[PDB]
Scaffold this active site. Sequence first.
Site, PDB file in Angstrom:
ATOM      1  N   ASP A   5      63.092 151.796  61.138  1.00 60.73           N
ATOM      2  CA  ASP A   5      64.278 152.053  60.336  1.00 60.73           C
ATOM      3  C   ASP A   5      65.019 153.288  60.840  1.00 60.73           C
ATOM      4  OD1 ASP A   5      63.323 149.934  58.824  1.00 60.73           O
ATOM      5  OD2 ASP A   5      62.386 151.240  57.328  1.00 60.73           O
ATOM      6  N   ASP A  53      67.700 147.873  58.656  1.00 60.23           N
ATOM      7  CA  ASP A  53      67.950 149.080  57.872  1.00 60.23           C
ATOM      8  C   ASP A  53      68.822 150.073  58.630  1.00 60.23           C
ATOM      9  OD1 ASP A  53      66.319 147.818  56.066  1.00 60.23           O
ATOM     10  OD2 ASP A  53      65.057 149.570  55.671  1.00 60.23           O
ATOM     11  N   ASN A 102      66.125 144.565  54.041  1.00 58.75           N
ATOM     12  CA  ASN A 102      66.421 144.432  52.618  1.00 58.75           C
ATOM     13  C   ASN A 102      67.578 145.334  52.209  1.00 58.75           C
ATOM     14  OD1 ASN A 102      64.216 146.498  53.108  1.00 58.75           O
ATOM     15  ND2 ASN A 102      64.723 146.977  50.973  1.00 58.75           N
ATOM     16  N   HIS A 103      67.678 146.520  52.817  1.00 56.24           N
ATOM     17  CA  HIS A 103      68.775 147.422  52.491  1.00 56.24           C
ATOM     18  C   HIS A 103      70.127 146.848  52.893  1.00 56.24           C
ATOM     19  CE1 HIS A 103      66.289 151.203  51.711  1.00 56.24           C
ATOM     20  NE2 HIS A 103      65.407 150.275  52.036  1.00 56.24           N
ATOM     21  N   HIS A 139      61.067 142.588  59.326  1.00 56.41           N
ATOM     22  CA  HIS A 139      61.266 143.815  58.566  1.00 56.41           C
ATOM     23  C   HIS A 139      60.164 144.018  57.535  1.00 56.41           C
ATOM     24  CE1 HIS A 139      63.507 147.231  57.064  1.00 56.41           C
ATOM     25  NE2 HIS A 139      63.387 146.763  55.836  1.00 56.41           N
ATOM     26  N   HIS A 185      60.157 149.142  57.475  1.00 53.08           N
ATOM     27  CA  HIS A 185      60.329 149.198  56.027  1.00 53.08           C
ATOM     28  C   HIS A 185      59.560 150.360  55.407  1.00 53.08           C
ATOM     29  CE1 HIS A 185      61.488 147.889  52.135  1.00 53.08           C
ATOM     30  NE2 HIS A 185      60.309 147.418  51.773  1.00 53.08           N
TER      31      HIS A 185
HETATM   32 MN   LIG Z   1      63.237 148.401  54.120  1.00 49.00          MN
HETATM   33 MN   LIG Z   2      63.997 151.413  55.023  1.00 38.93          MN
END
Ligand SMILES: [Mn+2]
Ligand SMILES: [Mn+2]
EC number: 3.1.3.16
Lengths: 296, 583, 361
Positions: free
Chosen positions: A56, A84, A116-117, A166, A240
Site C-alpha cells: 500500500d 490502495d 478496498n480503499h 489485495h 492491506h
Molecule cells: Mn486495504
Molecule cells: Mn491500506
Amino acid sequence: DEKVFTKELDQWIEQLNECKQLSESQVKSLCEKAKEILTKESNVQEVRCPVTVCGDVHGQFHDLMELFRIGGKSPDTNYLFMGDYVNRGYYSVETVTLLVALKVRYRERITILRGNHESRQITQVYGFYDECLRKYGNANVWKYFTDLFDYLPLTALVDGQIFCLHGGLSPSIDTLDHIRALDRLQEVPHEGPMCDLLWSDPDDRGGWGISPRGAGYTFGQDISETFNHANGLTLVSRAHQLVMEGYNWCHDRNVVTIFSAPNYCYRCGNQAAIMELDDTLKYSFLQFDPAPRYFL
Amino acid sequence: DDSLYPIAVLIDELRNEDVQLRLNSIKKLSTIALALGVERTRSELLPFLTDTIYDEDEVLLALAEQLGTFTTLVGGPEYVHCLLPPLESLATVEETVVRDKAVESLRAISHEHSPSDLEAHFVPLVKRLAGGDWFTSRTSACGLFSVCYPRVSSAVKAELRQYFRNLCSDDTPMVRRAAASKLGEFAKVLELDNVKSEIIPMFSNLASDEQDSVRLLAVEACVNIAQLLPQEDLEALVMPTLRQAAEDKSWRVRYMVADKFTELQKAVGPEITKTDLVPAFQNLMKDCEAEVRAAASHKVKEFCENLSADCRENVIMSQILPCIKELVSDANQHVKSALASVIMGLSPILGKDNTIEHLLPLFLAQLKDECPEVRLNIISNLDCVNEVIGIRQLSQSLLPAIVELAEDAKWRVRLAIIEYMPLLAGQLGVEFFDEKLNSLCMAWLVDHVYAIREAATSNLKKLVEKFGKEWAHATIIPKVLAMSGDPNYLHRMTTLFCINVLSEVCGQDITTKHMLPTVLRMAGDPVANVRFNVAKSLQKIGPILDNSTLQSEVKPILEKLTQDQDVDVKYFAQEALTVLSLA
Amino acid sequence: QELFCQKLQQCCILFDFMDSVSDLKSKEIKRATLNELVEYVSTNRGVIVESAYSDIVKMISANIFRTLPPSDNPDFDPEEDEPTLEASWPHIQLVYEFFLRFLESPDFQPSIAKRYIDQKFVQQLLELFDSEDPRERDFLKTVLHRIYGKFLGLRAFIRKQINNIFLRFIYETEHFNGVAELLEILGSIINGFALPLKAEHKQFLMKVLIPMHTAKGLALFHAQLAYCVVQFLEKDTTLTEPVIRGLLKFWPKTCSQKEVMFLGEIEEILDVIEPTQFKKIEEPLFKQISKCVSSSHFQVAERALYFWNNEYILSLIEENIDKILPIMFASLYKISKEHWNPTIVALVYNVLKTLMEMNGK
Ligand SMILES: [Mn+2]
Ligand SMILES: [Mn+2]
Ligand SMILES: O=S(=O)(N[C@@H]1CCC[C@H](N2c3ccccc3Oc3ccccc32)[C@H]1O)c1ccc(OC(F)(F)F)cc1
C-alpha cells in the site's frame, strides 16, 4: 497520430514526477483511456516472471518516489502494485494520476490491482473526496477516478505459481475460475467474494473467522495451504494489513504481507518494503525508510 | 458601448446572489472602468461600489486589489482621495487577510498622493482608523504611520508621533502585537534626539510587557533600532533591555533572540559583543531548552566567522571550545544534527597546529555516532578539510573512517560518499585508489539499489576523464563487461548503461572495438527488458559510431528488432532508427 | 501556637524536585505532606486565618504558574491523545485538589483573598489552559468555575480575557487546545441570565461565538459551541435571525465533515425559532438546503434528509407550501444521478412523497 499522444503522455508523466497535478480534461481523457485499456484484462491478470511487487502507498507521493529510487524507474523495471492509493495521504491525487498515467503509457511494464480503499464510500469517508474537492473545486475528477476504479483488476497471478491480491482468501472462492467468473465492473459490495478478496487478512486462529474491520473474513494456515494445494500455487502475496517490518511471512511461508507506505500517517513509524521476483521467480525483499525532506 | 454597457454593470450585472459571477465581475471590472471614463468613473462608480458591497471575503478582496491597482485609472493624481473612503471602510472589516491587503494597497498608493491631498485626507484617515472602537481598525491603522510620517508637514508629524504612541498603548493584545511588529518599520524617524527622548522608554516598557509575543517581537525589531550604531549609548539605552530579555522565562523570547543573534551582532559592535554577547551566548548554549541550543549550535559557525580578527584564537579557545563539549555530547538529536553541518567550517580558523588536535577528535566522534543524519551532514561538506590539511595528514586519520563507513546501511550515506569521492581520489593519486579503493567501487557497482549504481557510474565517468583512457581500457572495461553475465536483469542494465556512459567520453575507437559487440550481443536476451533497454542505449551510443560500421552491422540488428512481438520495443526501435537518420 | 505550624510546614514543599530529574525519598515526602494536608484542610475547618491566605496563595503561585515547555505536535488529529510532555501530573494533582477544596470551603473569605488575587494572578492561572493533557484542562475549568462563582467582581476581566483568547485563536493561530474546556464552561454559565439582555452581552455572541464556527478543528468542540449558541435563543428569540444569517454566510463549502456539523447545529437550532420568525429565513435557508442535498456525498445528504424526523420541523414545514418549490427540482434531479447509493435515493423518494402528501406543486 499516436506519436503526438505518446509525447503528451510522456510530458504528463514528467509533470507528475514534479509533484504537479493535471487538469480536469486531461484527467478525464486519461481515465477514459485507462478504462479502455483495463476492460480487456481478466479478473486474474496474468503477469510474467520479471516483476516487482509492492504494498500500500496511500497517497504518500514522496515515499512512492523513494520506492522508485530503491526499485528503479517505472519504464525499465516491471512493477505489480496491489492497490490502495486514495485517502490517508496529502498527495493522493498526484499519486493516482502518475500511476494511471504510467499504466496507460506502459501497460505491459506496470500493473495495478484494485483495493478496498478504491471505493466511492471509502474514498468519501476517509477524505480522498476532500482532497479532490480542494484541488479541483468540484467532484468531476473524483467521479472519473471512482468510475475507473471499477475496472481495476481484483487479483493477479504471476508465473502461474504466485497468487497476488489485495485482501485475501474467501470462503466462497475455491478455484481461480470462481474469481474469473466474478463481475468486477461494479462498486465494492459490503459482502461476497469480491469484498472478501479485497478485505480478508491472515489469522493465527484456525478455520474461518469474522474480520474485526467489519468486512471480509479471517483465515488460518490450513485455509491457505488448502487453497495453494487446490490451485497449485507457491505463495500468496498480499498487502492491506500494516506490518512493522514492511514485509512479513506467515502461515509457514504460504502467505506474505507487503506494505510499501513507510511511517503510515506519520504515526505508525513502520518500515516499507517491496518484493522483487527475478527471471526465475526467486524472490527477494528490499526495505526502505520514509523519504527525507476559513471557509471560502 | 464597445464593452459591457454602463447600466448593465451598474444594476443588471451586479446581482449579488451569485458569488462566483460577482467575483469574476469585480475581477474584470477594469475593462469596463477604463472605458467608462475617468470622470464618470470617479464620480459614480466608487460610491456605488462602496455602498452596494455588503460583506463577502471574495468580492471584498477583489475590490481591495482592484482599488489598489486603479491608482492609474482614476485619471488624476489629485482625485486619488476618492479611493480612500472605500479602502478605509474595507480595512474596518474583521477578517485579517482583506484588511491586510487593503492596508497594503493604501501604503502603495500613498506614495502617489500629493502633499496637499495627503495632508488633507490621509492624516484624518489614519486618525479615524486609530480611533475606532473595534480592534481591527486599530490594528489596520498602525500600518500607515511608516509612510505618512516622513513626507508630511513638520508640524503634523509631531502629532502623528503622539497618535502612534497612543495607539501602541492599547488595552488589547492584538494592537500591542501589531505595534511591536511594525515598530521596526516605523522606528526609522531620522530624528535621533526625539528617539532617545520619547521612544526608548516606550521600547523598554514594551520589552517588559506581560505578553511573550510582544516581548519576542520587541527583541526582534531591536535590530532596526540598533542599526543606528549608537555604540556610545548602547551600553545604557538598549544593553540593559537585551540583558533582561536574555534571562527570559517565557522561553519563546530566548528562541527568538537565538534566531536573531547573528543579525544583532552585525550591529552591536565588536567591543560590546566581546563584552556581553560572548558570555550571553555561552550561557544560552548551556540552557535547558532544546530550540535555543539548536539555534545556537547552528549559528555558532556564522558567529565565529564574523568575529574580529584581532585575537579570535584566544577568545574562541577560552570560551567556545570548552563549552561545545557539552553540546556535542548532549543527548539531544536535533542539536547534534544541526551542529554537525556547521562545526566543520571552523577548521581553517583554529589553525593547522590546533585544529588537528582539537576538532579532529570531536569530528571523529561525531562521524561515528549512531544518528545517520549526523554522518550524512558530516560527509556532505567534507570537501572543506582537504584545502586546510595536507592530503597525507588527512589520509592518516580520516580516510580509514570514511572508507569504512562507505558501506553503511543507509544508502544515502553511500551516495554522499560516492559523489564526494572524485575530488579526494584526484587529490590522492591514480595509484592509491586503484590499489586500495577498488573493492569499494566494485561493491558500489553491484548494489541492488538503482540510485547507488547510477552514482557509481557517474563517479566512474568523472574519474575516467581525470585519469585518461589508459586506465579505462585497462582496468574498468573487463570488470564492467563481466557484470553482464549475471542472472538479475537489474544488474545487466547496469552494465548496459555504463557502456554508453563511458563511450560518450572515450570516443569511437574503444567504442567500436569493445563495447559495440557487447551491446549488439545483449540484444538477443530473451527478457524483453534487456532487449529494449538495448535500443534505449543504442539511441544514445549511435552518434558515437561511424557511418561504415552502422550500415555494416547496426542496421540489420535494428531491422530485426523492429519485428519483435512486443509493441514497446518496436516503438523504441523505430525512435532509435528515426534519431539515427537511417532512412 | 498551632496556627504557626500551618505556615511552617509549607517551607518543605517550597521547592520542586522536578519530575524529569531522578529523585529519592524527597518526592515521597512531598507527596505524603500534600496527601496529609489535603485531608487536614478538608476535615479541620476554621484553622485558616487571615495570615494563612498569603502563604497558601504564594505557594500555589510558585507551584503551578509556569508555561509548558516546547511541545511537539506533528499530527493535527487528536486521536493520539498521548500526553508525553506532561509527566508530573500525579504531583500537581494534589495541589489542584487542595486549591479546589479551599475554594469550596463554605467559610471562604473572598475579601481577604482579593488582597493577593489580582489581574496578574488570573492571567498566570489562565495561561495554564494550554496544557497538552485534558486531565489538567478539566481541573482548570473547574477551578475557573469555582473562582467565578466566588469572585463575581472579576467577571468583566474574565470575559475580556476570554474574548482576547478567542480572537487570537480565530485569526492569529489555532494552537490553543483548551478552547473546548472554555466553551463548555461559557455555555454553562450563560444559562444564569436572569436579567434583560444587555447590549454588550448580545453583541459578544455575534462578534465572538459566531465567527468561531470557521475554525479548522471545529469537530473538537462543535457540540459545546452549538449548545452555547442555542442557549442564547431560549432566552431571547429575537436574535435568532442574525445568528442564522451569520451561520449561513460562514458555510464551510470546502469541507463536508464541517457541513454535516453545520446541518446538525441548524437542526438543533430550528426547534426554538417560531414560524413568524422562521419565515424571514425560509426562502434563503431552503434554497441553500436544496444545493446542500444536491451534493454528491452520502452523509451530508442523509443528514439533510433526516430533517423529516422531528415533529417541530415537520410542523414548520407544513405551515406553508411555498417552500417546496426550490426543493422539487433538487428532489427530481437527485434521483437521476448518484445511482451507486440507493439508500439516499430511497430517502429522497420518501421525502418527495411526504412533500406530495400536502397539496402542492
Ligand atoms: Mn486495504
Ligand atoms: Mn491500506
Ligand atoms: O477566521 S476566519 O476564517 N479567517 C481566517 C483565519 C486565519 C487563517 C486565514 N488566513 C490567514 C490569516 C492570517 C495569516 C495568514 C493567513 O493565511 C490565509 C491564506 C489564504 C486564506 C486565508 C488565510 C484567515 O482568513 C474569518 C473569516 C471571516 C469572518 O467574518 C468577517 F468576514 F470577517 F466578518 C470571521 C472570521
